[PDB]
From a paper:
Here, we report the crystal structure of the Lit enzyme from [name] and describe its mechanism of action. Lit consists of four transmembrane helices with an extracellular cap. Conserved residues map to the cap-membrane interface. They include two catalytic histidines that function to effect unimolecular transacylation.
The His85Ala and His85Arg mutants were chosen for complex formation since both were essentially inactive with this substrate. His85Ala and His85Arg were crystallised in the presence of the FP2 substrate and structures of both mutant forms were obtained. However, while density that could possibly be identified with the substrate was observed with the two mutants, it was not reliably fit with the lipopeptide as model. Our conclusion therefore is that the density observed in the substrate-binding pocket of these two constructs corresponds to structured monoolein molecules. In the His85Ala and His85Arg mutant structures obtained with crystals grown in the presence of the lipopeptide substrate, a different kink appears in M3 that causes it to curve away from M4. Curvature in M3 is such that it separates from M4 toward its extracellular end to a greater extent than seen in wild-type Lit. In so doing, it acts as a gate to create an opening between the two helices that leads into the putative active site. The fenestration extends into the dome providing a conduit at least 10 Å wide along its length presumably for both the polar peptide and apolar lipid parts of the lipopeptide substrate and product to move into and out of the binding pocket. The particular ‘open’ conformations captured in the inactive constructs likely reflect the fact that the catalytic residue, His85, has been mutated to non-conservative residues.
Residue numbers in the entry: -10 to 213
The structure:
Amino acid sequence: SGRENLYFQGHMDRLITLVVSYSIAFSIFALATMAVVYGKWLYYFEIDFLNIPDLADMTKDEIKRNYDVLITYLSPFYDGALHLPTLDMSTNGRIRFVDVKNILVKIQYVMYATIMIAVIGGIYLLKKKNEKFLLHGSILTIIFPIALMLPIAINFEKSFVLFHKLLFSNDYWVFDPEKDPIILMLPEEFFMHAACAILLFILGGSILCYSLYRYLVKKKRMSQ
Ligand SMILES: CCCCCCCC/C=C\CCCCCCCC(=O)OC[C@H](O)CO
Ligand SMILES: CCCCCCCC/C=C\CCCCCCCC(=O)OC[C@H](O)CO
Ligand SMILES: CCCCCCCC/C=C\CCCCCCCC(=O)OC[C@H](O)CO
Ligand SMILES: CCCCCCCC/C=C\CCCCCCCC(=O)OC[C@H](O)CO
């Protein structure tokens, strides 16, 4: 009965490596996203770099406290509404930031799931002297954030319509600086730089996981 019982098991660890490697890819993507979204140093740098005080007709102290309040609001543990210290906000502006908050709690929710599956299924594979999930995952974390960008290559303007309508509850509403002046201290350059910082953290994440794959496999070879 052994023949038929390892044809099954070999295809099992092959699948488990797949689920674990994809779980590591998303876990690193979500961790990097959370580090940049809730990190303050990048935006604090953009204040002087992009001259946000003159962009928004605000002082630096006002920009930072309004930003600090926004990031506190986007945490999944703050149940209160968004109250900017010195800025007005329209009904559609509050709707937009609840949309932004909702994807973050969605990403974190799935992140906690993938982290557990990656570490639980990962030690099951390490107990079996199998390390390729640290290698398969390593390349998969580089490939995950970019597979989300693939629709851009088919149609640039059109597939940004798809992202916008999957995330946001108001199709047609745009930020009016008179009614939602926080838009003037969130320039487009900050969001692109933030996306680059996410991939930077993702790239660094795959390196350490690849380094772990090679640390494990060299010890495994120096044993046999
Ligand atoms: C040695 C094996 C490691 C096992 C032990 C560590 C396992 C956790 C793994 C990564 C850290 C993830 C921590 C959870 C990140 C919280 C998500 C988050 O930061 O959101 C909260 C808030 O919005 C922002 O301040
Ligand atoms: C997209 C790449 C990921 C970037 C990582 C995020 C880092 C930003 C930090 C906190 C969120 C700030 C609140 C988000 C503000 C959204 C404003 C908006 O809705 O877009 C502008 C609108 O299209 C014009 O009218
Ligand atoms: C290498 C790229 C890595 C991909 C990383 C993508 C992560 C997206 C997931 C959550 C973002 C949550 C915050 C959503 C903020 C979007 C607001 C926005 O994009 O508006 C900017 C606009 O272009 C000017 O105003
Ligand atoms: C079992 C597989 C082990 C694989 C080993 C690779 C682990 C990758 C760890 C970090 C890279 C992601 C970069 C994210 C930078 C730190 C993320 C973080 O934990 O901070 C969250 C933030 O502080 C919330 O407020």
